[PDB]
Amino acid sequence: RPRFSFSIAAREGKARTGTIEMKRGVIRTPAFMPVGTAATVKALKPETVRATGADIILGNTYHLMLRPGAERIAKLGGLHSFMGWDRPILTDSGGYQVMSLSLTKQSEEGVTFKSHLDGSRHMLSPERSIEIQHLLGSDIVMAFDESTPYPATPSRAASSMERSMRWAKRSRDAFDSRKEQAENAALFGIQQGSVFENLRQQSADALAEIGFDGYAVGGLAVGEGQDEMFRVLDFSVPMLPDDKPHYLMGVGKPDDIVGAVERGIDMFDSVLPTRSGRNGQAFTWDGPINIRNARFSEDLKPLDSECHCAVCQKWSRACIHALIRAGEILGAMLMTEHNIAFYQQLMQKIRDSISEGRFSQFAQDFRARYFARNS
């Protein structure tokens, strides 16, 4: 198996379906990456997450730095041991949570911040981020960038973008300086530029000049609304190299995913299926449902009557309703498993429909049913 090989098997308009081959396994694209945590009794088992169809999971570098720390994870054998997951793992850079969760100092050098847990001091930079992602042992490494809060002025958007591109070169060089990392992992760069077309083009040109294994679209899913997100994708994705994966970070709802694949995105991550499952919300082909609703108390149908997941083969809405209303952790576990599996089945229908040249029809059929809400 190679370090990183992206092959496009079929196209329909801007949509693509194919595979990323890595040493730890094959990733089918378009791909949804669930957000991983430590393998403990409070989370789904990794064998359960794999059985839902996930080919790769995501780790948050910022949270792993704060607890238990990347040095400790490295001593435990790396993130694959820590998470009980032997297939590919993508790590984000840590920078987005720095802006939104932590911040002592900020400059072109990097950032110093305090842990929201215990007040300890931590530092991130292109060089430090790549080194920490090396300690975590991840397979896909994200360049460290600077996020611009939403909404952003044209000036703050241009300056964060230009800093992100200098930091993207520094991330590239840091990654290349460690043979063990450069020969075994892959590195993605992140396009910035907010809603501004010339800034997005500037960013894409800089990233393609540096050269990366894949290209992420950053700066979206931060409050802008789906219509504006789609308009930005309309011109932004064609600016990225066609023969490399396109990754939309932090997206999103099922209809966000469908519309983004229509616009050339190959990879997605979101906490939404897990967060919804813990809050008693299930995704279905007829839209999301709130299982606590009284109308489900005697509903013998599964959460979704077409879903193939292990939960829907066995459990009725009525019984999941009973568990959730009682506060039984089993209820949240079943809804979370179903939601992650539903997302993987959405990706599979997307892949199959592109392969057969009927994805445009699938997207229209999907929206008509998802928004009618005849659950």
Q: Which residues are annotated as a binding site?
A: 92-96, 145, 192, 219, 307, 309, 312, 338
Name the CA dihedral angle for 285, 287, 292, 294, rounded to a multiple of 10 degrees. -90
Q: Which of 55, 139, 213, 269 is catalytic?
A: 269
In the shown chain, the binding pattern of residues 165 to 204 toward ligand QTQ, with x for contact by CB under 6 A and - for none, equals: ----------------------------------------
Site string for a copy of itself, 257-296 (x = CB under 8 A): ----------------------------------------
Token code pair at residue 157: 């958007």
317 binds Zn ion (CB under 5 A): no
Residues in the interface with a copy of itself (CB under 8 A) total: 12
Asked whether position 322 contacts a copy of itself by CB under 8 A, the answer is: yes
If one asks whether residue 307 binds Zn ion (CB under 5 A), the answer comes out as: yes
316: which residues sit within 8 A by CB, 6+ positions away? 299, 300, 301, 302
Of 34-42, 234-242, 255-263, 341-349, the segment contacting ligand QTQ by CB under 6 A is 34-42
- The candidate with the shortest Cα–Cα distance to 239, out of 192, 204, 206, 213, is 204
CA atoms 121, 112, 210, 213: torsion sign: positive
CB half-sphere exposure, 335, CA atoms < 13 A: 31
Site string for ligand QTQ, 119-148 (x = CB under 6 A): ---x---------x----------------
Residue whose CB is less far from ligand QTQ, 37 or 316: 37
Q: What is the DSSP string of 107-126?
A: SSS-EEEE-TTT--EEEE-H
Start-to-end C-alpha separation, the chain: 44
Nearer to a copy of itself, 228 or 298 (CB): 298
Q: Does 312 bind Zn ion (CB under 5 A)?
A: yes
Question: At closest approach, how far in Å is the CB of 306 from Zn ion?
Answer: 9
| Nearest to a copy of itself of 114, 314 (CB atom) | 314
71 in contact with ligand QTQ (CB under 6 A): yes
Query: Is residue 31 involved in binding ligand QTQ (CB under 6 A)?
Result: no
Beta bridge pairs of residue 27: 20
Nearer to Zn ion, 130 or 311 (CB): 311
Most distant CA pair in the chain: distance in Å? 61
Tell me the one-letter amino acid at 289: I
Applying CB under 6 A, among 15, 31, 49, 239 the residue interacting with ligand QTQ is 49
Buried b (16+ CB within 10 A) or exposed e, 66-101: beeebeebbeeebbbebbbbebbbbbbbbbbbbbee
Q: Which helix (H) or strand (E) holds 17?
A: strand 15-22
Question: Is 92 annotated as catalytic?
Answer: yes
Active site residues: 92, 269
